Amino acid sequence: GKEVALTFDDGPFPIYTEKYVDILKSMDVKATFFVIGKHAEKHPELLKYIVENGNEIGLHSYSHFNMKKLKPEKMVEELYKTQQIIVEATGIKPTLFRPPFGAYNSTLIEISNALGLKVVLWNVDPDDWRNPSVESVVNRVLSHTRDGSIILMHEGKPSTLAALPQIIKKLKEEGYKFVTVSELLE
Amino acid sequence: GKEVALTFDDGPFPIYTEKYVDILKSMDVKATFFVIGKHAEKHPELLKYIVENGNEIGLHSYSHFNMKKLKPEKMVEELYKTQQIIVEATGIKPTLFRPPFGAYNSTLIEISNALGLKVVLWNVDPDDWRNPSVESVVNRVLSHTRDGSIILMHEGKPSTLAALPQIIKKLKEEGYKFVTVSELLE
Ligand code: NI
Ligand code: NI
């Protein structure tokens, strides 16, 4: 066994969420979507869409601001609002949280855990936010992926929608099974 | 206040550890060295050197193998040996552990915590392992660094020794204070 977790930050987006999900469903492959609360409450049917197709939803905060310096009650507001938006939309209560920019402190770990959330970063960054060549995304992913890789990618990127089927195809050929972040960590 | 943690994996190395430390001491700036146990036990005087100059030492495991699939007792061996090498060399007991490739599971969190260690990844990756242009390292670091950034870099790289003083200089100009990973997280 060799497992890899594909992850998508910053969604959901109209058009692109549905695109990303169709691709993953068509290739028998699941992923984790770390969703911004302001985006999620505008588009509750897109969260239903992510989850009915077997994907995991995580939190990416409500506002998508650096949380490093927030007071604790403001950490609670950002995380609890997003949990509530997600559970109202899907009936599934998320267990993971990726902080904006991956910026955290001990306090944000302690608050997250008290809300039943694990904080997760990533360990493969193909820098897909600053839109690169769809061949360049693929190479970084395929040269850096090992057993237990958590690949940071972004929703709403056409250069990411383009890279997905090559990435999936090569890593299936290299003997990787695709898992949610929760099933990777257990 | 805006704080940033510079980190160095895979050391210590003869020549380059001393180089990296002299630079940081000369510019009044501290960093965290995530040290491989096999390297550390060969070079105990280089760990003394990292710490006498105010830097933090973390664990990077004993063998530097993917730990995702180890039995728990083998996780204990890799982490406890490295803790012991470090405390025998420096008298300071490390509190942080970065897993090889950032690959982890719940079991490795639970074992780490029972040995008084926090697991830490990173959230800025200038891909300095696959030796790039010393101007290209700088740009990735400076375009991606925010408050609470943990910058993954590697010991024993001349293209990294070259980038250090520009990186430090620009981020001091942008108003960043340089902290150990422990003082960033508190
Ligand atoms: Ni984001
Ligand atoms: Ni390493």
Author numbering:
A (entry chain A), B (entry chain A): 136 to 321
What do the authors say?
Acetylxylan esterase from Caldanaerobacter subterraneus subsp. tengcongensis (TTE0866) has an N‐terminal region (NTR; residues 23–135) between the signal sequence (residues 1–22) and the catalytic domain (residues 136–324), which is of unknown function. Based on sequence and secondary structure analyses, NTR was confirmed to be an intrinsically disordered region. The crystal exhibited crystallographic properties comparable with those of the WT crystals suitable for structural determination. These results suggest that NTR plays a role in maintaining the solubility and inhibiting the crystallization of the catalytic domain.
Our previous study revealed the crystal structure of the wild‐type (WT) enzyme containing the NTR and the catalytic domain. Although the structure of the catalytic domain was successfully determined, that of the NTR was undetermined, as its electron density was unclear. In this study, we investigated the role of the NTR through functional and structural analyses of NTR truncation mutants. The truncation of NTR significantly decreased the solubility of the proteins at low salt concentrations compared with that of the WT. The NTR‐truncated mutant easily crystallized in a conventional buffer solution.
